[PDB]
Ligand binder design. Structure first.
Ligand SMILES: O=C1N(Cc2ccc(-c3nnn[nH]3)cc2)c2ccc(Br)cc2C12CCN(S(=O)(=O)c1cccs1)CC2
Lengths: 11, 224
């Protein structure tokens, strides 16, 4: 879950 | 009356992060050239909403103390504020960034996108209400940070940690009202009136998403 937000937050 | 060096520093970091936003040329060109049909208008709105999510995360990451919060709390804050932050940025772009003709065309597109007046009417009522306050860039940036760093969002595990980040921002905003509008003591109360008005969009947006059989899988996952 929340895969897109997780990626954006790590970038 | 002046901000302390610590408050000036906090405000600078917020302002710097906020000033990074710039609408890309490709989106602006679409508002101008695309066919005026419900599906083409809706697609333009979807791309704008999607791009705002990316804009929101980049802004949030640079907010002082955000990266000190627990990973799951960073996610809860982003999910909790995404709709409110979107409408606040929208109010600013509609009333300040877009030229008169482009904003007129974007409104025409919004009003002819297949979206019900139940959601369109409070949206434009909010833009006019924000326009009345003649908000400065510092006011927009601080209000956005206050919305994002809201300690009462669902699924936050360490609320006290969020409160410690939000309180100094409310302190700075109130002090800027006292410095720049001393003849207008109700100015801070007016800004607070926008925070509560923004919260009403959470329901309007949730209902709008449930009304789809227009269906956008990516955005539905972010907004739940
Ligand atoms: O999101 C909006 N924004 C913000 C925004 C901010 C920044 C970037 C950006 N991208 N890259 N750099 N900056 C893009 C969009 C904005 C600004 C002015 C107006 Br008039 C309108 C909008 C919308 C409001 C919500 N609608 S909506 O019709 O309700 C909808 C359709 C599907 C899901 S929600 C979409 C357009």
């Amino acid at each position: 879950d929340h895969q897109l937000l997780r990626y954006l937050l790590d970038k | 009356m002046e901000l302390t060096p610590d408050q000036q520093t906090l405000l600078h970091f917020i302002m710097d992060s906020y000033n990074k936003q710039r609408m890309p040329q490709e989106i602006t060109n679409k508002i101008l050239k695309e066919a005026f049909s419900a599906e083409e208008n809706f697609l333009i709105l979807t791309e704008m909403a999607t791009n705002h999510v990316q804009v929101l995360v980049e802004f949030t990451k640079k907010l002082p103390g955000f990266q000190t919060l627990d990973h799951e709390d960073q996610i809860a804050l982003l999910k909790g504020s995404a709709v409110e932050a979107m409408f606040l940025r929208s109010a600013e772009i509609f009333n300040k960034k877009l030229p008169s003709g482009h904003s007129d065309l974007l409104e025409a597109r919004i009003r002819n996108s297949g979206i019900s007046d139940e959601y369109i009417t409070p949206m434009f009522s909010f833009y006019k209400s924000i326009g009345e306050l003649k908000m400065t860039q510092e006011e927009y940036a601080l209000l956005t940070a206050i919305v994002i760093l809201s300690p009462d969002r669902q699924y936050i595990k360490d609320r006290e940690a969020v409160e410690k980040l939000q309180e100094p921002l409310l302190d700075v905003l109130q002090k800027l009202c006292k410095i720049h509008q001393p003849e207008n003591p109700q100015h801070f109360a007016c800004l607070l009136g926008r925070l509560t008005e923004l919260r009403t969009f959470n329901h309007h947006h949730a209902e709008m998403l449930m009304s789809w059989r227009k269906f956008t899988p990516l955005l539905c996952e972010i907004w739940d």
